[PDB]
Tab-separated table of C-alpha atoms and ligand atoms in Angstrom:
chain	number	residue	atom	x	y	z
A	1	UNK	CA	0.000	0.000	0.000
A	2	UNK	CA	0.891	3.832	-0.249
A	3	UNK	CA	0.202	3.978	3.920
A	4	UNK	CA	2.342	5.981	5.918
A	5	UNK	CA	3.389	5.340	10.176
A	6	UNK	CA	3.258	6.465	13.346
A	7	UNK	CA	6.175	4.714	14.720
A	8	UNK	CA	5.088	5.405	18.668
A	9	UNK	CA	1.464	4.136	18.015
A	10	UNK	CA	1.678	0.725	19.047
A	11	UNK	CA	3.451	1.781	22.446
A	12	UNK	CA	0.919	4.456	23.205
A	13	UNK	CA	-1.191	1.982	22.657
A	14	UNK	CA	-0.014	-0.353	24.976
A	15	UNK	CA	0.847	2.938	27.538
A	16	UNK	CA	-3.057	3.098	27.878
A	17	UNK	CA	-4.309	0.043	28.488
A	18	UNK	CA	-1.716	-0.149	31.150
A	19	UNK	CA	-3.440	3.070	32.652
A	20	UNK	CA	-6.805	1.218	31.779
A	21	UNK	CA	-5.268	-1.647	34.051
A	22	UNK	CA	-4.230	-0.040	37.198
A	23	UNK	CA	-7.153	1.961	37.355
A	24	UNK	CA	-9.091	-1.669	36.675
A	25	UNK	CA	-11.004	-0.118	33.777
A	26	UNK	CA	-13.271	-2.731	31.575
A	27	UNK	CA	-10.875	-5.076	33.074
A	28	UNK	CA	-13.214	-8.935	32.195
A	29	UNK	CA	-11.048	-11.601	34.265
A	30	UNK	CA	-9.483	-12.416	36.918
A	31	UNK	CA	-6.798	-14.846	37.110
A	32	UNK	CA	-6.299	-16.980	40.458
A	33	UNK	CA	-2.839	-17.821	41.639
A	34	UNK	CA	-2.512	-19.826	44.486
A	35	UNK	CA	-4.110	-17.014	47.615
A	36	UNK	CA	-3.208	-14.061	44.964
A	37	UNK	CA	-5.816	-12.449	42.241
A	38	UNK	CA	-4.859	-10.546	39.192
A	39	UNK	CA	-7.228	-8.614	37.607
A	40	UNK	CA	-6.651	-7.982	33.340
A	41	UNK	CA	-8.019	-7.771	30.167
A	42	UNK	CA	-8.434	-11.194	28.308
A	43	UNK	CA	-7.443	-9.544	24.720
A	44	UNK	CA	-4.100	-8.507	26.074
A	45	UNK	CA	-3.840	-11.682	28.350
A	46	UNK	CA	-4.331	-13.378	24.807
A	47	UNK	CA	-1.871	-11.102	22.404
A	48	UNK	CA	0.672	-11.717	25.243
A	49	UNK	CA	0.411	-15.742	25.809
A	50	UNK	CA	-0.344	-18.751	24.066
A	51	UNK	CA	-1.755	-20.478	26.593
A	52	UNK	CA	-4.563	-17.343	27.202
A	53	UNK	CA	-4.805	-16.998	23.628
A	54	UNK	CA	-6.180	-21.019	23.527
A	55	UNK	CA	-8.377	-20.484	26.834
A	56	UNK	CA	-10.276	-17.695	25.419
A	57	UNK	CA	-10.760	-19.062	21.834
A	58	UNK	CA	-12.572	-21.838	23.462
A	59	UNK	CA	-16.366	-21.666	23.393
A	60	UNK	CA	-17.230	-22.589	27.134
A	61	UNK	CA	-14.040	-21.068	28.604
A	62	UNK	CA	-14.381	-17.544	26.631
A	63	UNK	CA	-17.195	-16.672	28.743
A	64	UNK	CA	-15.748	-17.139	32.409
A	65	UNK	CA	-14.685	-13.783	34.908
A	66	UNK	CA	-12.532	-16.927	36.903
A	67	UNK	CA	-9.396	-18.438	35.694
A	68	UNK	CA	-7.440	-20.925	38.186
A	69	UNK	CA	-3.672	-21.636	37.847
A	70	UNK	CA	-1.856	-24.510	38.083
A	71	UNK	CA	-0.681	-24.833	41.924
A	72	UNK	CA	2.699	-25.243	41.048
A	73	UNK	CA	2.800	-21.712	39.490
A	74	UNK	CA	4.310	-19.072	41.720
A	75	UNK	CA	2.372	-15.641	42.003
A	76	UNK	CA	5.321	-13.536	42.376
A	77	UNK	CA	6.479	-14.904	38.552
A	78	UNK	CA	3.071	-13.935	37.185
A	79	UNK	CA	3.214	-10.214	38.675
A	80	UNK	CA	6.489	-9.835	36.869
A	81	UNK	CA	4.992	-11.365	33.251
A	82	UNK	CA	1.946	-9.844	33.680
A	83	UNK	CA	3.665	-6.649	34.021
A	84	UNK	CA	5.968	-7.774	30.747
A	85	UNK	CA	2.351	-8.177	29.109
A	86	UNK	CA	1.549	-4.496	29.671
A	87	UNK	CA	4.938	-2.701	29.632
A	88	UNK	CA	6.916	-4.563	27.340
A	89	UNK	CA	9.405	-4.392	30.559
A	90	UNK	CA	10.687	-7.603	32.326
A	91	UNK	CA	11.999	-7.535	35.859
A	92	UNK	CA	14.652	-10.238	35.438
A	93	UNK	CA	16.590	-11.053	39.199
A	94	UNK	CA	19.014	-13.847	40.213
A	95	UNK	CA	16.435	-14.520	42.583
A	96	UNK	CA	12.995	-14.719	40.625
A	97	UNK	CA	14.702	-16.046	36.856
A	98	UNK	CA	13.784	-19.677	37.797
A	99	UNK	CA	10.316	-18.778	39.019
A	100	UNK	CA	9.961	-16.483	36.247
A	101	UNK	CA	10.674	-18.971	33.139
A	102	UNK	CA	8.886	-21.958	34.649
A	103	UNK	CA	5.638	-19.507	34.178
A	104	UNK	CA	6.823	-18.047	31.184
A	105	UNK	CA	7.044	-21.886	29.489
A	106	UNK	CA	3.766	-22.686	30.947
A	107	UNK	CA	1.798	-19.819	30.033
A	108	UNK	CA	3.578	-20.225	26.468
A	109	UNK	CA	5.759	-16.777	26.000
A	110	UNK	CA	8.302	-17.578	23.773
A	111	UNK	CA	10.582	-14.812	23.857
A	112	UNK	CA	10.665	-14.375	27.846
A	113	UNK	CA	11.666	-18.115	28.213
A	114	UNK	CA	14.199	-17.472	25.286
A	115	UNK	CA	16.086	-14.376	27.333
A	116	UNK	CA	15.739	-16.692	30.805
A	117	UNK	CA	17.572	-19.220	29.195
A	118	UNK	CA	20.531	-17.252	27.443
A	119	UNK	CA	20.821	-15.460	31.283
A	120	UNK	CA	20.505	-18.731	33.199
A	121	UNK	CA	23.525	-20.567	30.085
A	122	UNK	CA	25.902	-16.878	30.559
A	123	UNK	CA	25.711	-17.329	34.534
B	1	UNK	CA	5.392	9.392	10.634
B	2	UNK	CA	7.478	7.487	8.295
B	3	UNK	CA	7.283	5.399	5.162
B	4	UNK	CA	6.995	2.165	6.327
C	1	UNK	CA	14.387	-0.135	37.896
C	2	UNK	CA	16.475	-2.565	36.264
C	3	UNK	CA	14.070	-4.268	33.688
C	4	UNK	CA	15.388	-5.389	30.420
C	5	UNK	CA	12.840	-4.273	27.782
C	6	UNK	CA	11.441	-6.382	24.363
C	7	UNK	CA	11.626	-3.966	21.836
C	8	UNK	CA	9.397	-5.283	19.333
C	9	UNK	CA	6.423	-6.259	22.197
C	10	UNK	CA	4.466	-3.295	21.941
C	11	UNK	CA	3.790	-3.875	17.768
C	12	UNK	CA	3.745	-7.808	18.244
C	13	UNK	CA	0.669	-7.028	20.832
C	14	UNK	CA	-1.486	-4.781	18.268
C	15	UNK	CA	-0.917	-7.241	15.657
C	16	UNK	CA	-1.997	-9.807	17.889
C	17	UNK	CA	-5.338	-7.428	18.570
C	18	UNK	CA	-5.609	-6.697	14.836
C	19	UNK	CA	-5.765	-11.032	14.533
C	20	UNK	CA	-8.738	-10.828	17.025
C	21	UNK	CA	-10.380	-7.873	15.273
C	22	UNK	CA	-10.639	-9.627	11.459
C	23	UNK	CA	-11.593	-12.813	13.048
C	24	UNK	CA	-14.474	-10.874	15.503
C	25	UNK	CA	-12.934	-12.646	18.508
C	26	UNK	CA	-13.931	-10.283	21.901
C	27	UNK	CA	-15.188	-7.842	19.729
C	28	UNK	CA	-17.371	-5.854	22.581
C	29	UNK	CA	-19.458	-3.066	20.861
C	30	UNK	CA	-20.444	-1.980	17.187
C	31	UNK	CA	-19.350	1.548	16.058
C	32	UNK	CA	-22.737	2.794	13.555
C	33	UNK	CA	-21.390	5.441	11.186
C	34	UNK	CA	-24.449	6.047	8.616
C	35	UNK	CA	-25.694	2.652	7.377
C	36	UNK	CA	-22.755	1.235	8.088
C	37	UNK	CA	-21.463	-1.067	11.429
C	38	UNK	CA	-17.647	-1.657	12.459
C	39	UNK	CA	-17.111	-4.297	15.236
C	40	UNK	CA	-13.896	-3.732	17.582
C	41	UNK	CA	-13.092	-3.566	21.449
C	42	UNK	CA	-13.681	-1.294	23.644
C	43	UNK	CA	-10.572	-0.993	25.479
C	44	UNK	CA	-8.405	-0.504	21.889
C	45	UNK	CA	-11.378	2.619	20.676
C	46	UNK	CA	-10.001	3.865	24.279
C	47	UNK	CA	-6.228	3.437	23.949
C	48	UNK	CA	-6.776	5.241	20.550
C	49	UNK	CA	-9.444	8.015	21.008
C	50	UNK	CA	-9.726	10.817	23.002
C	51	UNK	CA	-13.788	10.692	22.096
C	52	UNK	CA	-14.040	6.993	23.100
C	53	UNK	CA	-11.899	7.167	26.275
C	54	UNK	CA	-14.889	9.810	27.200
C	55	UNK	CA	-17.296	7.433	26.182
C	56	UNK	CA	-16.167	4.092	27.636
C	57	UNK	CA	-15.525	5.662	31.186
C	58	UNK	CA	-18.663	7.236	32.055
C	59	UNK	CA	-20.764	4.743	33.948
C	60	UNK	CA	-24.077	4.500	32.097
C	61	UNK	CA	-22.150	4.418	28.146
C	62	UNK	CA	-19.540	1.749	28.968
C	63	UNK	CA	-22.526	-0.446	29.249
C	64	UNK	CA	-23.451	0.116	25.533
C	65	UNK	CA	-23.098	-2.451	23.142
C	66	UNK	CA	-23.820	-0.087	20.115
C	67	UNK	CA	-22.949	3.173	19.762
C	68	UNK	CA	-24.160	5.910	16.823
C	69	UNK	CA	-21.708	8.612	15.216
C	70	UNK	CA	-22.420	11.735	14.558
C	71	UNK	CA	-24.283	11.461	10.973
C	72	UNK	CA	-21.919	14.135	9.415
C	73	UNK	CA	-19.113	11.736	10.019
C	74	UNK	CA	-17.952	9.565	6.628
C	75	UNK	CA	-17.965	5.704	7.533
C	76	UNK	CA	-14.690	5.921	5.487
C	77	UNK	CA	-12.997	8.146	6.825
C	78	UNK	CA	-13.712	5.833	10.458
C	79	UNK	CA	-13.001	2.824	8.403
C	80	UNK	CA	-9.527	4.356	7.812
C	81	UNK	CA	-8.838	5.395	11.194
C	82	UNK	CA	-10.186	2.108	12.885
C	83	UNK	CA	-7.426	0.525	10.606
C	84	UNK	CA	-4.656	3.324	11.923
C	85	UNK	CA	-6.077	2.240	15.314
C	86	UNK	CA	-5.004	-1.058	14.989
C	87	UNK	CA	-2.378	-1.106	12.737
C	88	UNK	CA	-0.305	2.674	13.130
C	89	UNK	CA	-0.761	2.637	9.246
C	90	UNK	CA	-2.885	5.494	8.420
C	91	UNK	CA	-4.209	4.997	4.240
C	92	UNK	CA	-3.804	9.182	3.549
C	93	UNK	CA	-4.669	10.107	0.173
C	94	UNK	CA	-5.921	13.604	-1.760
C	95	UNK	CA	-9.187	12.049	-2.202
C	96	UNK	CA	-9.728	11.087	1.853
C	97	UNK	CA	-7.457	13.862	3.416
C	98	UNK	CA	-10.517	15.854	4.301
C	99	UNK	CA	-12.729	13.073	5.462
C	100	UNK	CA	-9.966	11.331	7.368
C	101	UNK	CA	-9.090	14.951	9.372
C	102	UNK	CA	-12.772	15.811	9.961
C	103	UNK	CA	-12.963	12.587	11.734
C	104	UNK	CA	-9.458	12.674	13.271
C	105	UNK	CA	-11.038	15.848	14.886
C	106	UNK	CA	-14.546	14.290	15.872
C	107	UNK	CA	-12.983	11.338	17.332
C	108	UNK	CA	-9.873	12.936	19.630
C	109	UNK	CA	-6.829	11.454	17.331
C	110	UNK	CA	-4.110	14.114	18.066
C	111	UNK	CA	-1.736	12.470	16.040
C	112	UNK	CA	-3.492	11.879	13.495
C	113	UNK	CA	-5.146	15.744	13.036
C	114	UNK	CA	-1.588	16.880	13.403
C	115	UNK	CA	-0.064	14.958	10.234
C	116	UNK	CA	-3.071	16.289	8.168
C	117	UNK	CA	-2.958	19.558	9.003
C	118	UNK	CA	0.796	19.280	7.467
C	119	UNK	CA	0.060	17.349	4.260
C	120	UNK	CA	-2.797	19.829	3.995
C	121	UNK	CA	-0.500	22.496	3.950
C	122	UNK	CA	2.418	21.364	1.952
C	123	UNK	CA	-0.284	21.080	-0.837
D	1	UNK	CA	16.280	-7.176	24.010
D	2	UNK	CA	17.699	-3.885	25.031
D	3	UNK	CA	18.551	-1.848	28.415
D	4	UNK	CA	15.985	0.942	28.508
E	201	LIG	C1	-1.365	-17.626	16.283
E	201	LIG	N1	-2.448	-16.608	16.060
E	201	LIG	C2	-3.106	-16.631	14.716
E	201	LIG	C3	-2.813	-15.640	17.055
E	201	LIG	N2	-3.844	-14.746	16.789
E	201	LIG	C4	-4.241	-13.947	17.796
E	201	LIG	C5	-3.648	-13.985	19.050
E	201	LIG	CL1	-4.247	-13.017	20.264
E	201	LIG	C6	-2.565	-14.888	19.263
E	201	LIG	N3	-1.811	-14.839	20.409
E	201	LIG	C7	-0.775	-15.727	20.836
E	201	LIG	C8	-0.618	-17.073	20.413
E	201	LIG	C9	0.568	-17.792	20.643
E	201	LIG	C10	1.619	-17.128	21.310
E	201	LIG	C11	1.493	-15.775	21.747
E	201	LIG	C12	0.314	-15.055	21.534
E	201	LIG	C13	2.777	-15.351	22.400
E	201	LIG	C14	3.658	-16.611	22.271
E	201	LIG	O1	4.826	-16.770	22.614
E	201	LIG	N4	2.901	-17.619	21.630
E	201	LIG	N5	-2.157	-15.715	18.267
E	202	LIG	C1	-5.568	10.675	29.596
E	202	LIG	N1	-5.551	9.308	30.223
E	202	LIG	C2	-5.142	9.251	31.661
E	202	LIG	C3	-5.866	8.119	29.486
E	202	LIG	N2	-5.856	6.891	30.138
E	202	LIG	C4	-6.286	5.822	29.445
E	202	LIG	C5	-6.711	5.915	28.127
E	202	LIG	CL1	-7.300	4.559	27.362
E	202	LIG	C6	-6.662	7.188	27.485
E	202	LIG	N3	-6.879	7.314	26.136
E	202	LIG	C7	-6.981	8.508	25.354
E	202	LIG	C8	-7.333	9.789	25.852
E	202	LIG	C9	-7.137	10.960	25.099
E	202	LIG	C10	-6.563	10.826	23.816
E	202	LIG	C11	-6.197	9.552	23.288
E	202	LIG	C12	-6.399	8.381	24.024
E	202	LIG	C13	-5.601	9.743	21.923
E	202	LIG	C14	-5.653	11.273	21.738
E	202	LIG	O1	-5.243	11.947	20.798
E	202	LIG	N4	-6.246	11.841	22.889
E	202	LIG	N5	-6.246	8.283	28.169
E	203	CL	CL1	6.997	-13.210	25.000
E	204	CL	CL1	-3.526	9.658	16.939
């Protein structure tokens, strides 16, 4: 096409539904982790992660405000990747990079589990 | 803007 | 803080809404411009729109599943922006310039107003 | 990945 671009679009973009989020704006779902709740928005849950992008394309599961964890994922590790969902920011440590890619390999984000392992192979 |  | 930072996230996440969009998965509320209707989410019109941030936060409109334009607005000039919306591609051409502004300005689209203004201009 |  003859288009032109905003280059900061996509980041403002992002920018506001982070403001949307904290302020818990339209927010549809909350996801359970063991005692901790995290409220978001299931498009950006499913633009982020593979496994939320196959929960919510389902035809019974699209339609539920509760989603339960697996017990063996660590809430601490989802704060951190849900805040890489809506910042584009990751808050790698020595002490949360183990916690961090488990969840990142089970809720199916490719390139955070790619940077935990080159971190995890240069240490 | 730029041309993508 | 001392996050490390995904540069290409922020794009990778509005494709991933744009995916959701042309397949009418989430879709939340149809936008009625004229005789024509255009299906997107809510929380995207809001990251976007100045006019549907307004809209989507007060507490009897977020409700809405439908909401009517303004009948002096061009459904394509919105069909153009609702593309730059989820895209950052905006389809500018001599034939649309004035439609496209006119609804830049209706809708809240800083950006947007701002680059027509200049081609506008320059011509 | 970059250091913002
Ligand atoms: C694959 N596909 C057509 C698609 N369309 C829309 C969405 Cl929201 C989506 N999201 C998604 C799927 C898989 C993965 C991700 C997002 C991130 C990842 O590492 N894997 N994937
Ligand atoms: C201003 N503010 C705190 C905010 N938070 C969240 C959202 Cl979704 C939002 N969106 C919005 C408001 C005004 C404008 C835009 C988006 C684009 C524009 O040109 N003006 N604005
Ligand atoms: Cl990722
Ligand atoms: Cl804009």
């Amino acid at each position: 096409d003859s288009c032109i671009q905003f280059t900061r679009h996509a980041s403002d973009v992002l920018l506001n539904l982070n403001r949307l989020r904290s302020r818990d704006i339209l927010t549809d779902v909350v996801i359970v982790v063991s005692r901790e709740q995290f409220r978001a928005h299931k498009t950006v849950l499913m633009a982020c992660s593979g496994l939320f992008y196959s929960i919510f394309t389902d035809q019974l599961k699209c339609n539920l405000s509760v989603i339960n964890l697996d017990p063996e994922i660590n809430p601490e590790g989802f704060c951190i990747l849900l805040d890489f969902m809506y910042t584009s920011r990751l808050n790698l440590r020595e002490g949360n990079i183990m916690a961090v890619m488990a969840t990142a390999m089970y809720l199916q984000m490719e390139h955070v589990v790619d940077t935990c392992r080159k971190f995890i192979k240069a240490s | 803007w730029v041309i993508p």
